[PDB]
Amino acid sequence: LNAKVRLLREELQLLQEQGSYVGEVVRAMDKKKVLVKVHPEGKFVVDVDKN
Amino acid sequence: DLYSRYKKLQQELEFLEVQEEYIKDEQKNLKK
Amino acid sequence: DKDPILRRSGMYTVAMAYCGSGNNKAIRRLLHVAVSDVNDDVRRAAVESLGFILFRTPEQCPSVVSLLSESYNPHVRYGAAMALGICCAGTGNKEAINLLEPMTNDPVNYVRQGALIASALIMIQQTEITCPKVNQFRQLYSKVINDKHDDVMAKFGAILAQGILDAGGHNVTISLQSRTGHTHMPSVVGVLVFTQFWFWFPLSHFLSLAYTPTCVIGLNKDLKMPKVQYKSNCKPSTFAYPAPLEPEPNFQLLDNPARVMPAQLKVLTMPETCRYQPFKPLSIGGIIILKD
Amino acid sequence: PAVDTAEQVYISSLALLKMLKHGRAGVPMEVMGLMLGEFVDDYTVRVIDVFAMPQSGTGVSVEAVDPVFQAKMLDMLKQTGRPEMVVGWYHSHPGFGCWLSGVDINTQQSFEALSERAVAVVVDPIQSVKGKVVIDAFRLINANHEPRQTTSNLGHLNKPSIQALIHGLNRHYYSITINYRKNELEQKMLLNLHKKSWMEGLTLQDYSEHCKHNESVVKEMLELAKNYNKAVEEEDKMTPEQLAIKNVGKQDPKRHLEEHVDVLMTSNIVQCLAAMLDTVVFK
Ligand SMILES: [Zn+2]
């Protein structure tokens, strides 16, 4: 119960963090970069997180 | 020795009862 | 009463009344207030008072304050920190240090402050051999004090912790009970009025009362210092000053007056070659009158 | 020469309710008013009442239209037992959080010039919810060092919000803790507000309607039990991760059964006990 309450108390400031775009991967390339189509915008050559 | 063990067990039992009551109250108030 | 400050005074009077009595009624009332009240200051005082109530059985305070320390209310977490500190002052409790270590990096600055001060209170005078985390906590205090992007209250707690860990030089310990088993009123009052520094910093100068020298002093028939040398059947490294910051002997000698720790009391002995003898056993400690 | 961080602004229940009601009434605008109170000591600024003033403006600004009203109101309150004089001003920021803008800072500068310790209170109606009210108190920092002296931990317990920090907190103005000290009669009235009439407690409930509700809920529980039987057969042919997303967009028979059980038990127990109590009390 205490964990539930604590999570619901920090969730207010956890919910103001910016979302993340959802894109479609075209093909991996280069050192560690990727080519992604972020609809409705154009494509990007983005990095990849270490994980 | 045996008297000390017996009285220590009695004190432990009383402490366990106190803790049980406190935890039940804490759960009831955590719901609120 | 309806005033939160009056309820807080109620918690404090419970503590002072049932100081060192292990009273189940008082513990029940304190825990009820801690888990029920509407005012966080009252909750904090209620959790804190448990240390005064249970300071004679340090092994039990963790058993009641662990869950409160791991709580959703930072005020109750700070109360648990200070309760452990008061309960296990001058004791180096492994369980207390283990409970306090996770809280030293809590999200809340004043929770960190309370954790640091409680850790210092518990580990006063303790060496590497006696407690295996004193050096770690010393480095933690230095790191917090040196970091330039840390909370000011966390820095306050770290500085106070440095001060408390090395008190009176290194020749003083905090113990709410005398060596004979009586409640030390000056120390109880000092620790209470020091805990009341959340509201007034100048009151921090009350742990001076709680400070109690750790010394075995000899005396002559005329109450004057004799130049005796006591023996401690312990290794030189253990029970020794940490260090001046920039074949192990199995026996050491200490000169009257001697800086002898409460744990060292059990081992201190007098060499029979010397003409002076200790009237009451040296294990008791304190001012001892030496017969000849 | 200090202005300490343990200073607090005591807002009465009446003042808080008036502020919130006026702010909510003026949802798109920054409706505003004056705060009456006393400067007790250097650690208290008691706010005992607030009164709105005739004002007009757009959604980008609001200004007062007559000072004669303010003077006359102060006099006519003193005549009835409120000799307190203005200690600050309050205005509402509807959804922008709590902070001061440039015009707000200019108004607070005028108030500071009049009285040194005057404060500004920003109440945001729409972001306020039942449990919590979003409200803060402010004062300015001169062109200098530290604005205040800390002789306690009381000041550093609020974790200033990112929006206020962006808009100028701790740089052009500093916050003051708000406290809600109450008197015995205020406490008693607030507690008594929700108390219902005694007869309502003993009043029974139409037995036809009660039986109809029981019948409806039992009929629903029948289908819920069918679905519960179906669901229990699952939870073994389910990935440990798939179980969580299994109950997304689909009914949960166990949860609904528990809720219906709770409601039925409460209603029936209450009705039976009330019936017996009435049976004895009324002859
Ligand atoms: Zn504004």
Tell me the DSSP string of D12-35: -HHHHHHHHHHHHHTTTTT-EEEE
Residue count (chain C): 292
C216: left (phi over 0), alpha (psi -120 to 50) or beta: beta
Tell me the CA–centroid distance for residue D13 and ligand 1, in Å: 23
Q: Which helix (H) or strand (E) holds D175?
A: strand D173-179
What span, in angstroms and rounded, lies between the C-alpha atoms of D131 and D129? 6
Resolution number, Å: 2.8
Q: Which residues of C touch A2 (CB under 8 A)?
A: 70-72
Encoding tokens for residue D244? 């969580």
What span, in angstroms and rounded, lies between the C-alpha atoms of C192 and C31? 19
Encoding tokens for residue C32? 């009820």
- Whether residue A40 is preceded by a cis peptide bond, meaning omega within 30 degrees of 0, is yes
DSSP 3-state of D121: strand
D63 contacts: CB under 8 Å, gap ≥ 6? D55, D56, D57
D91 marked as part of a ligand binding site: yes
DSSP 3-state of A28: strand
Lateral strand order in the sheet of C258-259 = C258-259, C215-219, C286-291, C277-278
Encoding tokens for residue C266? 């059990």
Q: Which helix (H) or strand (E) holds C215?
A: strand C215-219
For D127-143, b/e burial (b = at least 16 CB within 10 A) is eeeeeebbbbbbbbeee
DSSP 3-state of B16: helix
| C-alpha dihedral sign at B8, B13, B18, B24 | positive
Rounded to the nearest angstrom, the minimum Cα separation between B18 and chain C is 6
- Whether residue C257 is preceded by a cis peptide bond, meaning omega within 30 degrees of 0, is yes
A26 contacts: CB under 8 Å, gap ≥ 6? A34, A35, A36, A37, A43
D21 contacts: CB under 8 Å, gap ≥ 6? none
End-to-end CA distance of chain A: 32
Please give the single-letter amino acid code of residue C147: D
Phi then psi for residue D172, to 5 deg, are -110, -15
What span, in angstroms and rounded, lies between the C-alpha atoms of B14 and C27? 11
* CA-to-CA separations, C40 to A8, D13, D75, D132, in angstroms, rounded: 19, 20, 41, 16
Chain A (1-51) residues lying within 8 Å, Cβ to Cβ, of chain C: 2, 5-6, 9
Q: Which residues of B touch C64 (CB under 8 A)?
A: 19, 22
D93 marked as part of a ligand binding site: yes
Q: Which helix (H) or strand (E) holds C211?
A: strand C211-213
What span, in angstroms and rounded, lies between the C-alpha atoms of D28 and D162? 23
C185 contacts: CB under 8 Å, gap ≥ 6? none
Residue C78 pairs with which residues in a beta bridge? Answer: none
D82: left (phi over 0), alpha (psi -120 to 50) or beta: beta
DSSP 3-state of D156: coil
User: DSSP letter at D64?
Assistant: E
What span, in angstroms and rounded, lies between the C-alpha atoms of C187 and C264? 22
**Of residues C256, C204, C208, the one with CA closest to residue C228:** C256
Please give the single-letter amino acid code of residue C33: V
| C-alpha dihedral sign at D121, D125, D126, D128 | positive
What span, in angstroms and rounded, lies between the C-alpha atoms of C100 and C201? 23
Q: Which residues of C touch D153 (CB under 8 A)?
A: 110, 113, 153, 198-199
* CA-to-CA separations, D87 to D1, D11, D106, D123, D262, in angstroms, rounded: 19, 12, 16, 17, 52
Encoding tokens for residue C73? 């209310």
User: CB distance C70–A5 less than 8 Å?
Assistant: no
Q: Which residues of C touch B18 (CB under 8 A)?
A: 24, 27-28, 31
D100 touches D111 (CB < 8 A)? no
Lateral strand order in the sheet of C268-269 = C252-255, C229-232, C268-269
What span, in angstroms and rounded, lies between the C-alpha atoms of D47 and C66? 41
Q: Enumerate the H helices of chain C as residue ranges.
A: 4-17, 24-36, 40-53, 61-69, 74-87, 94-103, 109-123, 134-146, 152-165, 185-195, 207-210, 262-265
D104 marked as part of a ligand binding site: yes
Method: cryo-EM
B18 touches chain C (CB under 8 A): yes
C229 touches C268 (CB < 8 A)? no
Encoding tokens for residue C170? 């290194």
What span, in angstroms and rounded, lies between the C-alpha atoms of D281 and D283? 6
Q: Which residues are placed with Cβ below 5 angstroms of ligand 1, an ion?
A: D 101, 104
**Of residues C187, C198, C211, the one with CA closest to residue C55:** C187
Q: Nearest residue of C to residue A8 by CA position?
A: C72
**Of residues C125, C153, C151, C152, the one with CA closest to residue C138:** C125
Number of CB atoms found within 10 A of residue B21's CB: 13
Q: Which residues of A touch B31 (CB under 8 A)?
A: 1
Residue that has been written with the tokens 């930072």 in this structure: C74
What span, in angstroms and rounded, lies between the C-alpha atoms of C108 and C116? 13
C94 touches C134 (CB < 8 A)? no
Please give the single-letter amino acid code of residue C207: L
DSSP 3-state of A37: strand
User: CB distance D156–C153 less than 8 Å?
Assistant: yes
User: CB distance C28–B21 less than 8 Å?
Assistant: yes
Burial of D101 (C-beta count, 10 Å sphere; 0-12/13-18/19+): middle
What span, in angstroms and rounded, lies between the C-alpha atoms of C128 and C239? 9
**Of residues C53, C59, C55, C66, the one with CA closest to residue C24:** C53
Phi then psi for residue D91, to 5 deg, are -150, 155
Nearest to C35 among B14, B15, B22 (CB): B22
